[PDB]
Enzyme design. Structure first.
Site, short mmCIF file in Angstrom:
data_model
loop_
_atom_site.label_atom_id
_atom_site.label_comp_id
_atom_site.label_asym_id
_atom_site.label_seq_id
_atom_site.Cartn_x
_atom_site.Cartn_y
_atom_site.Cartn_z
N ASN A 242 6.59 -1.93 -9.86
CA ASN A 242 5.87 -0.99 -9.39
C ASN A 242 4.59 -0.78 -10.08
OD1 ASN A 242 5.41 1.51 -7.64
ND2 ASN A 242 7.08 2.73 -8.97
N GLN B 115 -2.00 2.64 -11.63
CA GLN B 115 -2.85 3.19 -10.47
C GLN B 115 -3.52 4.57 -10.69
OE1 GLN B 115 0.40 2.76 -7.17
NE2 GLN B 115 -0.60 4.77 -6.53
N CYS C 269 -1.45 2.15 -4.17
CA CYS C 269 -0.47 1.41 -4.03
C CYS C 269 -0.74 0.06 -3.35
CB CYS C 269 0.59 2.22 -3.64
SG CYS C 269 0.47 2.73 -2.02
N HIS D 27 4.80 3.85 0.46
CA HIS D 27 4.36 3.06 -0.58
C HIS D 27 4.50 1.58 -0.68
CE1 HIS D 27 3.84 2.63 -5.12
NE2 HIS D 27 4.90 2.77 -5.30
C1 VS2 Z 1 0.49 4.78 -2.22
C2 VS2 Z 1 1.28 5.50 -2.48
S1 VS2 Z 1 1.66 6.22 -4.24
O1 VS2 Z 1 0.27 7.09 -4.48
O2 VS2 Z 1 1.88 5.27 -5.13
C3 VS2 Z 1 2.99 7.50 -3.82
C4 VS2 Z 1 2.58 8.63 -2.52
C5 VS2 Z 1 3.43 8.67 -1.27
C6 VS2 Z 1 2.94 9.58 -0.57
C7 VS2 Z 1 1.79 10.40 -0.76
C8 VS2 Z 1 1.25 10.44 -1.99
C9 VS2 Z 1 1.66 9.40 -3.06
C10 VS2 Z 1 -0.43 5.21 -0.96
C11 VS2 Z 1 -0.79 6.87 -0.93
C12 VS2 Z 1 -1.46 7.03 0.26
C13 VS2 Z 1 -1.88 8.53 0.28
C14 VS2 Z 1 -2.41 9.13 -0.82
C15 VS2 Z 1 -2.49 10.50 -0.55
C16 VS2 Z 1 -2.06 11.23 0.39
C17 VS2 Z 1 -1.14 10.66 1.16
C18 VS2 Z 1 -1.08 9.21 1.18
N1 VS2 Z 1 0.52 4.52 0.13
C19 VS2 Z 1 -0.33 3.87 1.10
O3 VS2 Z 1 -1.45 3.55 1.12
C20 VS2 Z 1 0.65 3.46 2.21
C21 VS2 Z 1 1.52 2.10 1.60
C22 VS2 Z 1 1.96 1.46 3.25
C23 VS2 Z 1 1.51 0.22 3.28
C24 VS2 Z 1 2.27 -0.60 4.45
C25 VS2 Z 1 2.82 0.18 5.41
C26 VS2 Z 1 3.19 1.57 5.12
C27 VS2 Z 1 2.77 2.20 4.22
N2 VS2 Z 1 -0.39 2.98 3.26
C28 VS2 Z 1 -0.97 4.12 3.99
O4 VS2 Z 1 -0.81 5.16 3.86
O5 VS2 Z 1 -1.99 3.56 5.08
C29 VS2 Z 1 -2.45 4.74 5.80
C30 VS2 Z 1 -3.73 3.80 6.51
C31 VS2 Z 1 -5.08 3.57 5.93
C32 VS2 Z 1 -6.17 2.89 6.39
C33 VS2 Z 1 -5.98 2.24 7.43
C34 VS2 Z 1 -4.87 2.26 8.07
C35 VS2 Z 1 -3.59 2.88 7.56
#
Ligand code: VS2
Length: 215
Positions: free
Chosen positions: A182, A19, A25, A162
């Site tokens: 992952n 990614q 993710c 994540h």
């Molecule tokens: C992927 C995570 S990662 O980059 O591999 C590790 C990481 C965790 C936390 C912060 C940085 C890196 C996604 C990272 C989103 C992000 C990016 C930059 C800053 C902060 C956050 N994580 C998600 O997309 C999560 C995954 C998830 C899925 C289902 C349930 C709970 C979590 N989802 C999320 O943040 O969704 C927010 C959102 C966006 C649009 C519509 C509704 C909700």
């Protein structure tokens, strides 16, 4: 349910992806699940496009995050159930920026009709996975940056942040565990995979499990 199931053994899982610097993710989790479900529906294992979601799924936020359930619904409701092949819509968000969505010049690699949300119960998730295949799950990946290998018996379980893919489990091992794919390259963990203890909601693994349905 069966003592151990590993969908990689049935040739149902594609290679580990990357990614990059993009918080996509959720897209890798959703697509990884579709790839497996498509194969299980009787079609050849095909690499599908995460970029399609990152760029085109407007119900989610590209590199800023998203939900696998939203992604599944977007595919069905907004893209006529279509999922492009990765070769026709290559990943180009590794730098942290999602290029605009292009509605043409791609090839449909798979189609889905809907999605199901699984019970917040590990035994029930395992039972479904054993028969129907890999499941998309959300986890708390706080403790994952220092993961080098082995079965993680203690995981910080506070906030889901994540999206990953459950490809199997083993209940006959010393400490039963989940096998998780992952999206941080094969250099991370066990060739891109991580095994976490099963049965105690490690990393909040049972909280948000779901899977696409390919009719
Ligand atoms: C992927 C995570 S990662 O980059 O591999 C590790 C990481 C965790 C936390 C912060 C940085 C890196 C996604 C990272 C989103 C992000 C990016 C930059 C800053 C902060 C956050 N994580 C998600 O997309 C999560 C995954 C998830 C899925 C289902 C349930 C709970 C979590 N989802 C999320 O943040 O969704 C927010 C959102 C966006 C649009 C519509 C509704 C909700």
């Amino acid at each position: 349910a069966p003592a151990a199931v590993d969908w990689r053994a049935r040739g149902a899982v594609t290679a580990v992806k990357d990614q990059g610097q993009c918080g996509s993710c959720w897209a890798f989790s959703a697509i990884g699940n579709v790839e497996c479900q498509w194969f299980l529906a009787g079609h050849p294992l095909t690499n599908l496009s995460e970029q399609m979601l990152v760029s085109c799924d407007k119900t989610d936020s590209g590199c800023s995050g998203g939900l696998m359930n939203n992604a599944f619904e977007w595919i069905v409701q907004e893209n006529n159930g279509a999922v492009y092949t990765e070769d026709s819509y290559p990943y180009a968000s590794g730098e942290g920026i999602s290029p605009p969505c292009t509605t043409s010049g791609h090839t449909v690699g798979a189609t889905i009709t809907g999605h199901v949300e699984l019970p917040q119960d590990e035994a029930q998730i395992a039972a479904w996975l054993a028969v129907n295949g890999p499941v998309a799950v959300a986890v708390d990946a706080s403790s994952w940056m220092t993961y080098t290998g082995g079965v993680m018996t203690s995981c910080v379980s506070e906030q889901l942040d994540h999206g990953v893919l459950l490809v199997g489990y083993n209940d006959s091992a010393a400490v039963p565990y989940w096998i998780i794919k992952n999206s941080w390259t094969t250099q991370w963990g066990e060739e891109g995979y991580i095994r976490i203890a099963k049965g105690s909601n490690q990393c909040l693994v049972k909280e948000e499990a779901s899977s696409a349905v390919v009719g």
